[PDB]
Design a protein around this ligand. Structure first.
Ligand SMILES: CC(C)n1cnc(S(N)(=O)=O)c1
Ligand SMILES: CC(C)n1cnc(S(N)(=O)=O)c1
Length: 171
């Protein structure tokens, strides 16, 4: 069976228990922590691409009011995020299973830009999601996996200083 697991869940859970925040910039900012995924049960000889996207967890705008994150009362439909292709893609199952698949080069932006960057609505809450796409074979197949532990609010600067301190402590 195709098993997908989050590497460093212990560390993600420290961020999540504080409400995690990720910076977005016009040029794009890399994530900390980095999403690293443990994958087993691929065909070592089959061909796969690893895709990353961000699902809007709710339809609301969030604001840091008196030391606490609180959703707006005016929900709107959230357009789905664009997909980031892991740069090792396409690659053999063996490649993907020999070390954690690390999305260290994805950049989160708040502006429609050239290419590569993922465009996120600031003050929206996001749940990272991967797609494992079997390619080149006759039978195309997709397996998707969400990572609740990795939820965050896109922010142009850190609201909760406890997040700022954790980010520095573990980088
Ligand atoms: C606003 C943000 C979440 N977004 C960026 N691109 C999309 S799209 N056209 O649905 O791929 C949505
Ligand atoms: C640009 C606009 C959406 N915004 C206002 N404040 C933030 S912040 N620093 O992320 O809380 C973003």
């Amino acid at each position: 069976e195709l098993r997908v697991g989050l590497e460093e869940s212990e560390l993600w859970l420290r961020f999540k228990e504080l409400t995690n925040e990720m910076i977005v910039t016009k040029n794009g900012r890399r994530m900390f922590p980095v999403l690293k995924v443990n994958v087993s049960g691929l065909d070592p000889n089959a061909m796969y691409s690893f895709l990353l996207d961000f699902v809007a967890a709710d339809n609301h705008r969030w604001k840091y009011v008196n030391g606490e994150w609180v959703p707006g009362g005016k929900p709107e439909p959230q357009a789905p995020s664009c997909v980031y292709i892991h740069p090792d893609s396409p690659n053999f199952g063996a490649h993907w299973m020999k070390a954690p698949v690390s999305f260290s080069k994805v950049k989160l932006t708040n502006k429609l830009n050239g290419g590569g960057q993922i465009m996120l609505n600031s003050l929206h809450k996001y749940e990272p999601r991967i797609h494992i796409v079997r390619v080149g074979g006759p039978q195309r197949m997709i397996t998707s996996h969400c990572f609740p532990e990795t939820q965050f609010i896109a922010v142009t600067a850190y609201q909760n200083e406890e997040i700022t301190a954790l980010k520095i402590k573990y980088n």
